[PDB]
From a paper:
As antigen receptors, the lamprey utilize a family of highly diverse proteins called variable lymphocyte receptors (VLRs), which contain multiple, tandem leucine-rich repeat (LRR) motifs. The resulting VLRB protein is a 15–25 kDa, crescent-shaped protein with a continuous beta sheet where its concave surface forms the antigen binding site. This O6 VLR is relatively small compared to other characterized VLRBs, containing 178 amino acids (~19.2 kDa) and only a single LRR variable domain (LRRV1) along with the other usual LRR and CP components (LRRNT, LRR1, LRRVe, CP, and LRRCT).
The sulfate group of the ligand forms hydrogen bonds with Gln86, His109, and the backbone amide of Gly137 in an identical manner to a phosphate ion in the apo structure. Comparison of the apo and glycan complexes shows no movement of the C-terminal loop and only small changes in residue rotamers (including Trp138), indicating that the VLR is preconfigured for glycan binding (RMSD 0.28 Å for 172 aligned residues).
Author numbering: -5 to 0, 2 to 19, 21 to 171
The structure:
């Protein structure tokens, strides 16, 4: 269509890219269901509505980096089965809900660094096992600077890698 495109206010859209980075506290409504790449980085997010992404089944890239996310809701990524890139770095996450990445078989780039992962608490063990089993996709940087480095998901206060934590060192009382 001549000089006509199909976009959330304060975001910029082109093709199936939706750039909502840096608009500032909640995920905008009416992100098109055909969206393949979604930037939600550099906003004010401290939580997500459960189900917020459930209609965006064609997503291949999702950036949530550099928010202040304190927790993710269980199942929040369950519908994003075509996701290849998932950015969660530079947030305030202490653990990942059990099973959160289980339905994401196509991941090739995952960013988890610069979060205060709480490795003494029982709830770290899903993430510890996941990183240990998917080490070749956990990294840092972008394009020319992309480098895999699974030890950059680090335990707050000791800087030990999250993937080295096993059940016998954790305690429910530290949650």
């Amino acid at each position: 269509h001549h000089h006509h495109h199909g976009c959330p206010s304060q975001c910029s859209c082109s093709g199936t890219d939706v750039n909502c980075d840096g608009a500032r506290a909640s995920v905008p409504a009416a992100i098109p269901i055909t969206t393949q790449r979604l930037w939600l980085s550099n906003n004010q997010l401290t939580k997500l509505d459960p189900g917020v992404f459930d209609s965006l089944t064609q997503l291949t890239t999702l950036y949530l980096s550099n928010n202040q996310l304190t927790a993710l809701p269980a199942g929040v990524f369950d519908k994003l089965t075509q996701l290849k890139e998932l950015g969660l770095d530079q947030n305030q996450l202490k653990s990942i809900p059990d099973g959160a990445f289980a339905r994401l078989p196509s991941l090739t780039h995952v960013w988890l660094h610069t979060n205060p992962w709480d490795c003494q608490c029982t709830d770290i063990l899903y993430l510890s096992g996941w990183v240990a089993q998917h080490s070749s996709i956990v990294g840092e940087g972008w394009l020319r600077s992309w480098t895999v480095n699974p030890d950059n998901a680090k335990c707050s206060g000791t800087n030990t890698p999250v993937r080295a934590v096993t059940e016998a060192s954790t305690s429910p009382s530290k949650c």
